Amino acid sequence: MEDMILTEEMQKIMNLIQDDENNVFVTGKAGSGKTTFLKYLIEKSGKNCIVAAPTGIAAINAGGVTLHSLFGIPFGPITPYDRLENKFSEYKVECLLKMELLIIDEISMVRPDILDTIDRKLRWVYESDEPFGGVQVIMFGDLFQLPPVTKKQEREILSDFYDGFFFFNALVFKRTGFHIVELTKIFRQTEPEFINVLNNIRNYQVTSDELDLLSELKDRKISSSYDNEYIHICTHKADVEKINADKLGEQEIRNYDIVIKDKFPESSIPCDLHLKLRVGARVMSLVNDSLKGYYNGMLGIVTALEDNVITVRMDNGRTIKFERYTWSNTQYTLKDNECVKEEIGSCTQFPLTLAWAITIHKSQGLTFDKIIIHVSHTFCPGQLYVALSRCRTLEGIVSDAFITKQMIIPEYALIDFERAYKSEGNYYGKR
Numbered sequence: 001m002e003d004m005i006l007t008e009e010m011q012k013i014m015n016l017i018q019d020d021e022n023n024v025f026v027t028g029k030a031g032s033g034k035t036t037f038l039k040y041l042i043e044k045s046g047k048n049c050i051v052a053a054p055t056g057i058a059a060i061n062a063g064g065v066t067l068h069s070l071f072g073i074p075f076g077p078i079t080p081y082d083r084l085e086n087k088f089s090e091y092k093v094e095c096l097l098k099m100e101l102l103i104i105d106e107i108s109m110v111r112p113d114i115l116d117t118i119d120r121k122l123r124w125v126y127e128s129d130e131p132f133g134g135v136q137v138i139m140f141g142d143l144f145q146l147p148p149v150t151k152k153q154e155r156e157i158l159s160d161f162y163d164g165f166f167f168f169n170a171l172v173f174k175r176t177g178f179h180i181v182e183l184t185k186i187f188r189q190t191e192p193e194f195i196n197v198l199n200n201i202r203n204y205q206v207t208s209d210e211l212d213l214l215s216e217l218k219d220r221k222i223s224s225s226y227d228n229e230y231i232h233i234c235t236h237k238a239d240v241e242k243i244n245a246d247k248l249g250e251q252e253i254r255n256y257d258i259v260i261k262d263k264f265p266e267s268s269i270p271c272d273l274h275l276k277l278r279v280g281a282r283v284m285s286l287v288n289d290s291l292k293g294y295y296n297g298m299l300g301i302v303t304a305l306e307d308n309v310i311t312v313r314m315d316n317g318r319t320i321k322f323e324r325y326t327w328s329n330t331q332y333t334l335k336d337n338e339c340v341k342e343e344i345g346s347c348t349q350f351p352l353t354l355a356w357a358i359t360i361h362k363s364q365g366l367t368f369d370k371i372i373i374h375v376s377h378t379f380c381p382g383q384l385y386v387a388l389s390r391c392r393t394l395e396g397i398v399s400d401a402f403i404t405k406q407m408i409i410p411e412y413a414l415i416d417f418e419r420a421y422k423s424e425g426n427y428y429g430k431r
């Protein structure tokens with residue numbers, strides 16, 4: 001991007017990382033500029049940056065590595081007194097010793113014992129007692145993104161040692177802390193009444209005039225129809241696999257296999273393994289190309305299918321010939337006694353997927369012109385907020401049943417965390 005707008009909030013963040021002791025949590029909603037400012041922040045700073053994420057797909061997308069692979073953490077709940085097999089390699093140790101800045105994308109998805117373990121490994125590597133071995137830490141993401149649900153034994157082992165299952169519940173945050181900065185500008189659009197509604201929902205202060213609005217979105221006839229510009233936000237995998245499958249059909253189906261070269265982890269693949277399409281299929285772009293004219297999340301309709309090309313008419317009327325795209329799986333290594341990234345593998349596939357319906361999870365980070373929300377009756381805290389944040393307007397939302405005060409379940413650990421640091425200096429943890 002030679003396009004980047006640099007806002008007051010971004011410069012505020014760069015001012016503070018300048019002081020090598022300042023950890024920073026960079027937060028903001030979808031379309032807030034986070035991953036674009038992330039790239040801005042690697043280039044503009046000194047520092048030896050390392051870029052990690054809690055999942056392969058987020059790692060690939062941010063162009064870093066998983067936290068587990070970088071730091072060699074077995075998957076599972078880890079108490080402070082669970083002992084670590086900590087080796088890595090001579091390249092890895094040496095990379096971590098040169099790291100001047102650790103950047104973690106999608107931090108709200110980091111179950112806090114992960115943070116503490118990373119802290120243990122970096123004290124053992126630097127042979128220091130300082131938090132994170134002194135490494136400076138920038139954290140990116142959206143607080144009100146739902147963290148991954150903790151399994152049976154997970155909450156078991158861990159509840160003994162943690163007051164919470166959110167990333168800021170990490171024990172290290174008793175010994176260190178971080179500033180907070182909200183990215184407030186939504187570049188693709190600006191719609192104040194709707195975003196106010198969303199913020200009243202997430203803070204559990206919400207008018208009867210707002211509840212009137214929410215009951216309007218009900219249209220049961222549309223909700224039950226798959227011929228439309230609307231994408232169904234659904235909670236669970238298989239309702240989507242069923243909607244996207246049933247609309248596809250058996251008629252005139254083209255199938256396109258993924259291609260893997262060298263080393264790619266199965267869970268880091270952010271595209272279809274077997275892409276099954278037909279003229280008429282409804283689809284969504286998986287990558288940003290400003291030159292071709294598509295963004296990740298852009299919806300269109302297939303108008304033709306060839307071997308190496310897929311032609312799609314998007315909702316903005318443009319027509320785009322999609323070609324296979326290649327995703328690169330990297331890792332950190334030494335070249336010339338400098339820590340640099342290197343490609344260890346690849347996966348190649350057309351960057352589209354069937355879009356009649358998308359999970360709440362796979363749609364993390366995205367917004368659409370038109371959406372169909374399913375009030376799932378039984379509800380989990382913050383769920384209604386998530387579902388509605390997938391739209392860009394109020395008037396673009398359609399609910400399958402009335403939206404009721406019942407459906408609004410606050411997450412109070414988040415409102416308080418938010419409430420505190422907002423009055424405590426935009427800082428949380430030990431000063």
Ligand SMILES: Nc1ncnc2c1ncn2[C@@H]1O[C@H](COP(=O)(O)OP(=O)(O)O)[C@@H](O)[C@H]1O
Pocket residue numbers: 003004005006028029030031032033034035036037187188288295365
């Ligand atoms: N700093 C910026 N300046 C100008 N436009 C931006 C900026 N950041 C994002 N955009 C636009 O908004 C879109 C949102 O993408 P992204 O930066 O990934 O936001 P987020 O990750 O916070 O949802 C981009 O496709 C881009 O076209």
